[PDB]
Tab-separated table of C-alpha atoms in Angstrom:
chain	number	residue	atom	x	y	z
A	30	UNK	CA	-15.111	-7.221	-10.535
A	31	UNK	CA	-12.801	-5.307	-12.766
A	32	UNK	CA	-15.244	-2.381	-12.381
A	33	UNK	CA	-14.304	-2.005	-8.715
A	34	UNK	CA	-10.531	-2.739	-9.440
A	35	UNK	CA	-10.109	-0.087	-11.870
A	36	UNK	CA	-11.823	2.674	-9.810
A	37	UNK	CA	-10.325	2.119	-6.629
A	38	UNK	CA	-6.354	1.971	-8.090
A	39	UNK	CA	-7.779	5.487	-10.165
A	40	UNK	CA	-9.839	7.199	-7.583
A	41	UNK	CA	-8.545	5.552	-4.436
A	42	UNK	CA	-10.698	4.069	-1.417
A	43	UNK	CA	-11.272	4.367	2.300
A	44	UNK	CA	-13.525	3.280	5.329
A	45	UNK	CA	-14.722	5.235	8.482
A	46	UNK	CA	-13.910	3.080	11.516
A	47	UNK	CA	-16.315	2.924	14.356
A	48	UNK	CA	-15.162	4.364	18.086
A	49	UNK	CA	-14.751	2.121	21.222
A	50	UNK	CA	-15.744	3.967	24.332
A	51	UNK	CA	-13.615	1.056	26.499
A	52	UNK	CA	-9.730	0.560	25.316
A	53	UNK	CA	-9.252	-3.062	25.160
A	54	UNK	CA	-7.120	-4.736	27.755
A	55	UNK	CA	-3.721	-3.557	27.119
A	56	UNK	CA	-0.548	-5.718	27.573
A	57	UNK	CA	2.590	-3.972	25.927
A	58	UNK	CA	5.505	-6.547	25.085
A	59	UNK	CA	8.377	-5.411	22.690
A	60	UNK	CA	10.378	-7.457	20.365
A	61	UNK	CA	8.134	-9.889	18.695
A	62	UNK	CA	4.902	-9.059	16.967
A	63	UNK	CA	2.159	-11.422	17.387
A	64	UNK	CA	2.041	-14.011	13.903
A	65	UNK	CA	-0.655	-13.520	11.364
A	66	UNK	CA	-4.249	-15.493	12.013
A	67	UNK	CA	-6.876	-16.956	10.240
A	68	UNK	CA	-9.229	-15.168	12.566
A	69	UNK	CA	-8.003	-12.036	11.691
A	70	UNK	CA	-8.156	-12.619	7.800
A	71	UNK	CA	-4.922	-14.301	6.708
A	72	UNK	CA	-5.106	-15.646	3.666
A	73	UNK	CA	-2.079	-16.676	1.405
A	74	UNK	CA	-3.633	-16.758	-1.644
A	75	UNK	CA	-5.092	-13.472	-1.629
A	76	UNK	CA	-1.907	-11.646	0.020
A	77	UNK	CA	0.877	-13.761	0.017
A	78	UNK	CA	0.889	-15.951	-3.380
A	79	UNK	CA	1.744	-13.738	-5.805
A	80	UNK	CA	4.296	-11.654	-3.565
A	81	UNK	CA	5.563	-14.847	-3.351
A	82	UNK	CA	6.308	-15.347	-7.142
A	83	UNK	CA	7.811	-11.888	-7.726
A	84	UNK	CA	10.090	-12.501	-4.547
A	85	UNK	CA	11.417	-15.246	-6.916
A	86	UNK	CA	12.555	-12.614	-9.129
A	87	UNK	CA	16.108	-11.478	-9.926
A	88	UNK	CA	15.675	-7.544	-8.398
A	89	UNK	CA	17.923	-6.688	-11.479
A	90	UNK	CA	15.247	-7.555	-13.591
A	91	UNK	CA	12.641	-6.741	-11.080
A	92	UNK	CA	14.058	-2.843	-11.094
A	93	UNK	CA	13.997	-3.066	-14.722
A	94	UNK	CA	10.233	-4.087	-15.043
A	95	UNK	CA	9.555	-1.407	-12.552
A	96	UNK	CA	11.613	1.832	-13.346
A	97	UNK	CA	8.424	3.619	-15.169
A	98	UNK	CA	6.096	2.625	-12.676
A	99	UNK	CA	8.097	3.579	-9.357
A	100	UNK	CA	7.152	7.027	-8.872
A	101	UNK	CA	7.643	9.035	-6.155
A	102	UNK	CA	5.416	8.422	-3.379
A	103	UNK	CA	3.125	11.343	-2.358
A	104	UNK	CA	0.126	10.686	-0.918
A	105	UNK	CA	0.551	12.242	2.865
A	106	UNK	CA	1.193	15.672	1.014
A	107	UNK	CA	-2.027	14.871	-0.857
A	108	UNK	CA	-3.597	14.360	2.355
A	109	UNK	CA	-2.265	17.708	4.044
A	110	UNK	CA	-3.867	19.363	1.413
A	111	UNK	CA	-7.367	18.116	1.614
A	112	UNK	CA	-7.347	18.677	5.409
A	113	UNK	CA	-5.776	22.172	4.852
A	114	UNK	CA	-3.316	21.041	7.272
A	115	UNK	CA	-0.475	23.869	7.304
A	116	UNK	CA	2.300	22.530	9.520
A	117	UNK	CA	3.038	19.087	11.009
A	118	UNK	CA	5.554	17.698	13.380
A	119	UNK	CA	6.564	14.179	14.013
A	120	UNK	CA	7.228	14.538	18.324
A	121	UNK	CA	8.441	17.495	20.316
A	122	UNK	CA	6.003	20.043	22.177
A	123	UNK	CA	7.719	23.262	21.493
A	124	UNK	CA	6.246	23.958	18.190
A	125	UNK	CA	2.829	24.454	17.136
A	126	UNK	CA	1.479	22.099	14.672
A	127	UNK	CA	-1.832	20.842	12.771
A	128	UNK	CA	-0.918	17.493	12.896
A	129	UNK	CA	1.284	14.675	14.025
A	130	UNK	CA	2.429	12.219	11.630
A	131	UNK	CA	4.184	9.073	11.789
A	132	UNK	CA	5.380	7.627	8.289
A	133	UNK	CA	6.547	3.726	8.408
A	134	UNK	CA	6.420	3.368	4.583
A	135	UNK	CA	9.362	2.566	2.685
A	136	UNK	CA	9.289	5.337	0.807
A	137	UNK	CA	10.464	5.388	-3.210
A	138	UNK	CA	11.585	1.719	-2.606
A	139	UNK	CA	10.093	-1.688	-3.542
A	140	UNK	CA	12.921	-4.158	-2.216
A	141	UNK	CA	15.284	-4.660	0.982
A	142	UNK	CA	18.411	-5.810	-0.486
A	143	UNK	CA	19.905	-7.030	-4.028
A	144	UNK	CA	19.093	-10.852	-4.719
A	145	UNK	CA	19.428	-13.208	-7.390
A	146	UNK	CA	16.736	-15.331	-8.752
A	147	UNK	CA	15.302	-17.653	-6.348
A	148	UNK	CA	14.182	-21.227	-7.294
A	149	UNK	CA	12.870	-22.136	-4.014
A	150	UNK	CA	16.180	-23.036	-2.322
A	151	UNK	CA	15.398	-24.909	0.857
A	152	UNK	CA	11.696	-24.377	-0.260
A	153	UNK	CA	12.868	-21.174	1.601
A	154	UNK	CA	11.667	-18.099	1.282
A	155	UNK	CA	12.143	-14.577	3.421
A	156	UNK	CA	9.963	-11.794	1.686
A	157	UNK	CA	12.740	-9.634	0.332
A	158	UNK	CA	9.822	-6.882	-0.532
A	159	UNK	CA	8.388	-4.542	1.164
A	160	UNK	CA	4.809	-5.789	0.473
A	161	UNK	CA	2.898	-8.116	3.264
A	162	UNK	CA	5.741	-7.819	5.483
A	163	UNK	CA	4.180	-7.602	9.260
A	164	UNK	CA	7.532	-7.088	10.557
A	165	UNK	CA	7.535	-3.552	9.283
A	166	UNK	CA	5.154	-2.369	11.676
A	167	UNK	CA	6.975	-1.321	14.706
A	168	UNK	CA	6.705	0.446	17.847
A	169	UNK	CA	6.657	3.524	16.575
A	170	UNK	CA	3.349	3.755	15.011
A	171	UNK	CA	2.314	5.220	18.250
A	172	UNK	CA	5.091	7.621	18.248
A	173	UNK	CA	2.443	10.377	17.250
A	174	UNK	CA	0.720	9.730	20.985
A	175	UNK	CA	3.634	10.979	23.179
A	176	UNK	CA	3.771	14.007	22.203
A	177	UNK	CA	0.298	14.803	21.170
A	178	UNK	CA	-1.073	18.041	22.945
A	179	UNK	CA	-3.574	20.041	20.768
A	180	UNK	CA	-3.131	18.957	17.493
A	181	UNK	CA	-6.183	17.852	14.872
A	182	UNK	CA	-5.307	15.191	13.000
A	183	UNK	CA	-2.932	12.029	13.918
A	184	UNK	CA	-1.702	11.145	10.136
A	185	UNK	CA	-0.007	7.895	9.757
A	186	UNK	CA	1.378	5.902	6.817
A	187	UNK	CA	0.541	2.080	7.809
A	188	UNK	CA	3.406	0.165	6.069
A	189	UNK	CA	1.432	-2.847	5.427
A	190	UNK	CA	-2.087	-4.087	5.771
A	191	UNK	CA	-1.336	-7.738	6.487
A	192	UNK	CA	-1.320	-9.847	10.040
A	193	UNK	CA	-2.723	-9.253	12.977
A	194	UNK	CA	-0.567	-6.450	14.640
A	195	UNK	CA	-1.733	-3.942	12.053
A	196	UNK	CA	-5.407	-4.550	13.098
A	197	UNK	CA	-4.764	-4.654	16.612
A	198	UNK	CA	-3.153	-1.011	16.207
A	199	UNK	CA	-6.073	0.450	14.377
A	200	UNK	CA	-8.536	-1.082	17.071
A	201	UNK	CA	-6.536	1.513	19.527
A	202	UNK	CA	-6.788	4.383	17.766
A	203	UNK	CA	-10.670	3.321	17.368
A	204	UNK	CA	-10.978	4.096	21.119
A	205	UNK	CA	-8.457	7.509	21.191
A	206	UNK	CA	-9.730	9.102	18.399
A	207	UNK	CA	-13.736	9.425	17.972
A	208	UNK	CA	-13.117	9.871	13.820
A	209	UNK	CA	-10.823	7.493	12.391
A	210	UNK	CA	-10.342	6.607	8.439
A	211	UNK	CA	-8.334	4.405	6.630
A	212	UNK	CA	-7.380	5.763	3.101
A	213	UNK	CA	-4.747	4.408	-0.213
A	214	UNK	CA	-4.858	6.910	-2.622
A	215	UNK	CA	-4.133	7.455	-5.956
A	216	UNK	CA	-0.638	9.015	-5.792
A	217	UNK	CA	0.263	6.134	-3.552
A	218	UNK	CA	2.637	3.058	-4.335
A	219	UNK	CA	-0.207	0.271	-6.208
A	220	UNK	CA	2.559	-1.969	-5.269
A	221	UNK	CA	2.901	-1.938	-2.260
A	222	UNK	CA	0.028	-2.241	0.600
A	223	UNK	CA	0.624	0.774	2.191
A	224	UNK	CA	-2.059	3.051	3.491
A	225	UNK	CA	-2.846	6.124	5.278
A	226	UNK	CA	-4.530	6.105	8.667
A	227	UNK	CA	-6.544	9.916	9.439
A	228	UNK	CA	-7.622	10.275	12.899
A	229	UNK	CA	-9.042	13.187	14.371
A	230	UNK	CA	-11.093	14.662	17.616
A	231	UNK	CA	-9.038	13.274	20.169
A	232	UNK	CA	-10.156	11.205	23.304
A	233	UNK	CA	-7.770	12.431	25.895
A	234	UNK	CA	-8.868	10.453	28.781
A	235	UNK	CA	-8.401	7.217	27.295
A	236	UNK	CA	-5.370	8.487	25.689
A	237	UNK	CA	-3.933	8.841	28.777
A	238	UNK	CA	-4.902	5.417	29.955
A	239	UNK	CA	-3.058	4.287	26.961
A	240	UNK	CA	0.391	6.908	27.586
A	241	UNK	CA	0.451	5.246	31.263
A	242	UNK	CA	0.946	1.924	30.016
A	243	UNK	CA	3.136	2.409	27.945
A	244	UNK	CA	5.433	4.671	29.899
A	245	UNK	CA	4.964	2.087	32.735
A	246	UNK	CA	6.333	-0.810	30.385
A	247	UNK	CA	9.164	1.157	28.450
A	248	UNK	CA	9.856	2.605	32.120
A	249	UNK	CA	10.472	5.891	30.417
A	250	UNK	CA	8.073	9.037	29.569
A	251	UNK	CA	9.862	9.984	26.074
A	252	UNK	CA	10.135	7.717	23.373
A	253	UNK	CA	13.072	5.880	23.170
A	254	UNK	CA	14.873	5.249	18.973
A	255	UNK	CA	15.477	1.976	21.237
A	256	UNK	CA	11.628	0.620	21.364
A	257	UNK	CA	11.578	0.634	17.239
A	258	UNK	CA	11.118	-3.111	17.469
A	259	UNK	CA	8.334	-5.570	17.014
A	260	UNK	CA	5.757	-5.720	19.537
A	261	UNK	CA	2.921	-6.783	20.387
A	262	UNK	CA	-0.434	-4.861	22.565
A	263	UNK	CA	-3.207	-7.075	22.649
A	264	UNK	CA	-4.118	-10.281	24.374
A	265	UNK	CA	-7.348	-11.428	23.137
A	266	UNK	CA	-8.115	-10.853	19.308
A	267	UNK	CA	-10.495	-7.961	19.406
A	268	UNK	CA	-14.706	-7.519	17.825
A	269	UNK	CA	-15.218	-10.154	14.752
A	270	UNK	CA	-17.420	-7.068	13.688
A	271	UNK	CA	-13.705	-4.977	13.910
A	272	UNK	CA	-11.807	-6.931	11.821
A	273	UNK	CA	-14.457	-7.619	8.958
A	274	UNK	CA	-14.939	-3.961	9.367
A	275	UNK	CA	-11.118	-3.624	8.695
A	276	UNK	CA	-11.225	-6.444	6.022
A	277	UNK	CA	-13.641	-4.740	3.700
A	278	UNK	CA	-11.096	-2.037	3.179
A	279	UNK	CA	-7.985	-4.553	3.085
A	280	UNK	CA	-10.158	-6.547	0.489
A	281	UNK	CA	-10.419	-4.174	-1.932
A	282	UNK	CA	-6.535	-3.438	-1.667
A	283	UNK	CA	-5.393	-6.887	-2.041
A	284	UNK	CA	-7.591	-6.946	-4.628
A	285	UNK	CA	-6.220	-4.372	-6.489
A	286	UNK	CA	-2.442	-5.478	-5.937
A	287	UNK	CA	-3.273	-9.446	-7.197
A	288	UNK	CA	-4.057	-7.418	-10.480
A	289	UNK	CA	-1.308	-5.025	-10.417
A	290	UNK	CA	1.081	-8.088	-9.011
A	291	UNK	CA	-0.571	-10.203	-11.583
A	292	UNK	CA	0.573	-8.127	-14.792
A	293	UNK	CA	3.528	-7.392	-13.526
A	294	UNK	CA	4.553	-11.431	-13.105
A	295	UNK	CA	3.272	-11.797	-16.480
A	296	UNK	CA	5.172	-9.353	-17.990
A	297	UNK	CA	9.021	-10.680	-16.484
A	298	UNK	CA	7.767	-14.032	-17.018
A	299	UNK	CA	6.627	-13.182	-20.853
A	300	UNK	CA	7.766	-15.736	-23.409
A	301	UNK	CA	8.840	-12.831	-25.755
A	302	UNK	CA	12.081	-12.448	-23.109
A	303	UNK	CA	10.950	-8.397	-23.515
A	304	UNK	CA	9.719	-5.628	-21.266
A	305	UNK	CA	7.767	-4.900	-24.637
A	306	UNK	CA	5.135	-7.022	-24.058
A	307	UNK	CA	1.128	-7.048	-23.738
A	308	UNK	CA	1.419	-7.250	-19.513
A	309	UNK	CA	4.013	-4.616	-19.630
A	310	UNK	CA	1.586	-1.948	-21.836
A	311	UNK	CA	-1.492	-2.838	-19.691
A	312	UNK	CA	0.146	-2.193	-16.707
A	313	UNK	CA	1.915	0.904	-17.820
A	314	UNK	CA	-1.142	1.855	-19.182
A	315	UNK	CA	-3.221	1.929	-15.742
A	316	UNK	CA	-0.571	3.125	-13.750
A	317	UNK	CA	0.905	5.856	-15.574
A	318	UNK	CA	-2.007	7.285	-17.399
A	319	UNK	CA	-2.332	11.088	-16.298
A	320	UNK	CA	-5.842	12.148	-14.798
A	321	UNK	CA	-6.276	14.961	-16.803
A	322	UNK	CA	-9.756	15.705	-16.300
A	323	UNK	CA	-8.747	16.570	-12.942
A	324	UNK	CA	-6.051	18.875	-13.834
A	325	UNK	CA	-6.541	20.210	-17.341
């Protein structure tokens, strides 16, 4: 409904997670990350198709179409003040800290590298945006766990919300932390499907279990800037109840985006050859438009 479109791009959304008392069997392999599933809620229509058309796009004229709209991203400082959070770190255990916080967002960007329009040239097709790309979720979203002592809150930025390697990761952080939430909020890219993962009263037993695998497969007890690869953790795909758990969230996101994607194809597709156009305005519009009865 456009009810539930409108309010969750304005207001923002989230879940609560459920814990796991037992970590799933754990089987660390870096380099490749395991391939988006049907079991785990791939669906091309939904998340793919209209990244697809915009990919398409000259970025010249993609930049263009997106100058007013590209603001800066700030929703982990949004976050740090809800949670009062004071200071943060990112690794080290010399420094006291509220949080640890791991950001894998591209950050103020939309696009990896200048490209010309595409008219499917081989019927090829690598995603040149930084939107349903599974590859962007490294190693180092667990990053936060080596050097997490007695901190509150694990804060990190997911960079996408599609294939399976992003679920796989949250069902881990199910079982180390006993409160775990998955937010997008307002001051967030609604371009991207980037969200914000909160996790808080630690499980340090487990967590442990978890640290001793790891350092056991990377053969080292620091992290490593050489294990920011692909990878892959899980053997067996985890609870059906998980992942439809995980799904009701990722619905209403890629929900949001076919609309946001939607007007924004529209509007560099227009027949008036304009960025003044009716897609343009509406999209603008929703975007842009201050919330002033928060403020003022």
């Amino acid at each position: 409904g456009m009810d539930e479109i409108v309010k969750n791009i304005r207001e923002g959304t989230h879940v609560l997670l459920p814990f796991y008392e037992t970590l799933p069997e754990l089987n660390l392999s870096l380099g490749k990350s395991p391939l988006p599933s049907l079991e785990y809620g791939a669906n091309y229509f939904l998340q793919i198709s209209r990244v697809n058309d915009l990919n398409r796009m000259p970025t010249d004229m993609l930049k263009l179409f997106t100058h007013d709209i590209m603001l800066p991203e700030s929703d982990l400082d949004k976050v740090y003040e809800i949670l009062k959070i004071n200071s943060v770190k990112y690794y080290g255990r010399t420094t006291r800290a509220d949080a640890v916080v791991a950001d894998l967002s591209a950050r103020n960007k939309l696009f990896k590298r200048e490209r010309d329009a595409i008219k499917s040239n081989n019927h090829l097709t690598e995603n040149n945006l930084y939107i349903s790309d599974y590859k962007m979720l490294t190693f180092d979203v667990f990053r936060p766990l080596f050097d997490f002592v007695n901190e509150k809150y694990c804060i990190i930025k997911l960079p996408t919300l599609f294939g399976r390697g992003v679920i796989d990761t949250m069902r881990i952080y199910c079982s180390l932390f006993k409160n775990v939430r998955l937010l997008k909020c307002v001051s967030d890219s609604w371009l991207k499907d980037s969200a914000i993962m909160v996790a808080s009263d630690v499980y340090k037993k487990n967590l442990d279990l978890f640290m001793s695998h790891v350092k056991s497969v990377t053969k080292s007890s620091s992290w490593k800037d050489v294990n920011t690869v692909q990878f892959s953790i899980l053997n067996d795909p985890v609870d059906t109840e998980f992942t439809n758990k995980f799904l009701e969230f990722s619905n209403r996101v890629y929900e949001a985006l076919y609309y946001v994607h939607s007007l924004l194809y529209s509007s560099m597709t227009s027949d008036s050859k304009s960025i003044e156009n009716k897609h343009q305005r509406r999209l603008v519009k929703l975007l842009l438009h201050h919330h002033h009865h928060h403020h003022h």
